[PDB]
Amino acid sequence: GVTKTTTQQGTGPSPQVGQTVVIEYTGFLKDTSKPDNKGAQFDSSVGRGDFETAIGVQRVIKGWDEGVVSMKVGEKATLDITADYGYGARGFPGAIPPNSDLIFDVYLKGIK
Amino acid sequence: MGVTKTTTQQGTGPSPQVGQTVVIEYTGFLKDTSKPDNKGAQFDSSVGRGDFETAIGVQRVIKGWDEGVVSMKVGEKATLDITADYGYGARGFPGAIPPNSDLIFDVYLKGIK
Ligand SMILES: O=C(O)[C@H]1CCCCN1
């Protein structure tokens, strides 16, 4: 469903269901012909500011819910998220095509 | 209930029925009742690019569009006031649509395949 790659190990606490996480992130459409399978960037907190959400309660795609609760504060990770754990067959109009596997760089900076 | 349609240009072409592919031009806003026409931040628009083509009425888009668009005629422009229940519900697209966001869409039905 979601495959994680740790590019920086974190050692703080690991978010649990219902906690508000603070993350920096960049989202990419998956393109296996590209380095690290990163195709077009569709979204990013960078510049916008750190993104906050309660995790594990389906306020974001399942791939984030599942990926981010497996992280530890301080961890930088890449989440490879299959379409059905992302925006599935519907996609998101204007942003993400139907059935798009997704690649996210996620930086877990804290828990509220 | 969840979706109220204000027709802003009457259309006279055919009307979609469930499962037909529709071709629409749209602009999406977060609803903001302290703004004119209830239109808060614009998060998306197909104006100036390709139309959005989709089967209508089969939950491939938010229910507000499934109900709203099938009540339209080709050529019709309409403002769709969509509650969270008929929009993306309790999920959000980060940076664009918070969870449980009411939505306003300007929709323009330009064809049925
Ligand atoms: O833009 C926002 O506020 C976020 C909240 C968490 C879910 C996604 N949308």
Helix (H, G, I), strand (E, B) or coil at B70: helix
Portion 25-84 of B in contact with A at CB < 8 A: 26, 28, 43-46, 52, 59-61
Experiment used for this model:
X-ray
Q: List Cβ neighbours of B113 (8 Å cut-off, separation of 6 or more).
A: B20, B21, B22, B23, B53
| Rounded CA separation A21/A32 (Å) | 29
Q: Which residue of A has its CA nearest to B90?
A: A59
| Helices (H), ranges, B1-113 | 63-70
Provide the 8-state DSSP code for B93.
B
Q: Which residue of B has its CA nearest to A47?
A: B95
Catalytic residues of A: 25, 42-43, 61, 87, 104
Give me ligand 1 centre to Cα B91, in Å. Answer: 8
Phi, psi at A77, each rounded to 5°: -140, 160
- For the CA atoms of B18, B21, B26, B30, the dihedral, rounded to the nearest 10 degrees, stands at 50
How many structural domains is chain A composed of? 1
Which amino acid, one-letter code, is at A105? D
| CB contact set of B37 (below 8 Å; sequence gap of 6+) | B79, B104
Tokens of B36: 């004119």
E strand or H helix at A67: helix A62-69
Range of the structural domain that residue B62 is part of: 3-112
Phi, psi for residue B63 in degrees, rounded to 5: -60, -35
Query: What CA–CA distance (Å, rounded) separates A77 from A106?
Result: 5
Q: Ligand 1 centre and the CA of A46: distance in Å?
A: 15
Which protein residue's CA is at the shortest distance from atom 3 of ligand 1? B98
> Ligand 1: does its nearest atom lie under 6 Å from the Cβ of B89?
no
The CATH number of the domain where A10 resides is what?
Answer: 3.10.50.40
**Residue among A45, A32, A34 nearest A82 (CA):** A32
